[PDB]
Amino acid sequence: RPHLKIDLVQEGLRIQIIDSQNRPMFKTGSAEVEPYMRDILRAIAPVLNGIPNRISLAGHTDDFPYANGEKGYSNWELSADRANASRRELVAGGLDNGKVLRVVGMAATMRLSDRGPDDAINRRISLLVLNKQAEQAILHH
Amino acid sequence: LRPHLKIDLVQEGLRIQIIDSQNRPMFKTGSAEVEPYMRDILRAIAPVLNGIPNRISLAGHTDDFPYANGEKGYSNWELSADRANASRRELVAGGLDNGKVLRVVGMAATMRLSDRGPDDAINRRISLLVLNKQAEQAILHH
Ligand SMILES: NC(=[NH2+])NCCC[C@H](N)C(=O)O
Ligand SMILES: NC(=[NH2+])NCCC[C@H](N)C(=O)O
Ligand SMILES: NC(=[NH2+])NCCC[C@H](N)C(=O)O
């Protein structure tokens, strides 16, 4: 059973989804979120509604490339699709309108460092509960 | 008159906007297909971006009009993200180097243009961002 890891960062609250068996939370090349991940995402949505802050959603991939592999569909499209896939699950969980400020596709640029040598663990999404400083930053860009 | 570049300093880098005098939207309604005149511009921008060591972020935008089922299904978030990646593929086709892109962003309709309503058609667009080293480290060394 997967769990959320929530800790403080400069930009606010970072939320990571972590599986105990170090199992990838997405099938390779897939932006379909699994039933187990579905439940934990929908469950945290009312909590996010309580927190007056807005959120940023990020999608990630392993560094297994597509055939072209940046000319057409790539890890950029896939990571972005994973971000929005998690977004739709939060909404299904009852996430309020206007809670999302940003969806982000990171491809394989944000590599985890202490979660083992298997690159497949990077197939994931992450959440960021933005503080006022991070939000005002993003908005005035 | 030909469209021009609007460049200003923002917190995580150098933002690049493409401003059209003829007020042509970069995308048709509900479409993530880059309009012809913007394709030419993005391809022209790519080799210049190759000239600097900095990595790039790409953001997509939509007008205020929502989709049929609000935000439960395909929404302006998906559309804006798809528009960001469409501009990405144009840049790559223009000769953008491998590894230049660090981030793609969907902003939906949260960032209307500086003096237009959120309903205006020219909100359907993309914007470019040249990331400073600090933003790049906050992402890579995260
Ligand atoms: N349960 C696990 N530890 N899985 C790791 C292996 C994942 C497999 N190599 C893949 O790409 O799909
Ligand atoms: N089904 C595939 N085409 N897999 C290869 C690409 C996998 C991709 N890098 C991911 O994170 O899922
Ligand atoms: N169901 C619809 N007709 N939706 C139209 C949404 C258009 C979208 N706001 C855009 O910027 O292109």
Least distant ligand from the CA of A26: 2
End-to-end CA distance of chain A: 39
Decide: A93 and A46 in contact? Cβ < 8 Å.
Answer: yes
Q: How is residue A112 annotated by DSSP?
A: -
How many domains does chain A contain in total? 1
Instruction: Please check whether residue A80 touches B, CB under 8 A.
Output: yes
What residue type is assigned to position B12 of the chain?
Answer: E
A60, two tokens: 């990630």
Q: Give chain B as a DSSP string.
A: ---EEEEEEETTEEEEEEE-TT---SS-TT--PPPHHHHHHHHHHHHHHTTSS--EEEEEE--SPPBTTBTSSS-HHHHHHHHHHHHHHHHHHTTPPTT-EEEEEE-TTSS--TTS-TT-GGGSEEEEEEE-HHHHHHHH--
Task: Judge residue A126's burial from the number of C-beta atoms within 10 Å of its C-beta, 0-12 exposed, 13-18 middle, 19 or more buried.
Answer: buried
Q: What angle do CA B78, B79, B80 make, to 5 degrees?
A: 95
Residues A90, A35: Cα–Cα separation, whole Å: 13
Residues B128, B96: Cα–Cα separation, whole Å: 13
For residue A55, what is the enclosing H or E element?
A: strand A55-60
Decide: A26 and A64 in contact? Cβ < 8 Å.
Answer: no
> Residue B43's domain spans which residues?
1-142
Sign of CA dihedral A50, A51, A52, A56: negative
Question: Under an 8 A CB cutoff, do A80 and B104 touch?
Answer: yes
**Cβ pairs bridging A and B (under 8 Å):** 83
CA distances, B90 to each of B15, B46, B51, B55, B59 (Å):
18, 9, 17, 16, 14
| B86 CA from centroid of ligand 2 (Å) | 19
Instruction: Please check whether residue B122 touches A, CB under 8 A.
Output: no
- Ligand 2 atom nearest the C-alpha of A122 is 11
Residue tagged 């569909």 (tokens): A73
Is the backbone peptide bond immediately before A98 cis, with ω within 30 degrees of 0?
no
Residue tagged 């000239």 (tokens): B51
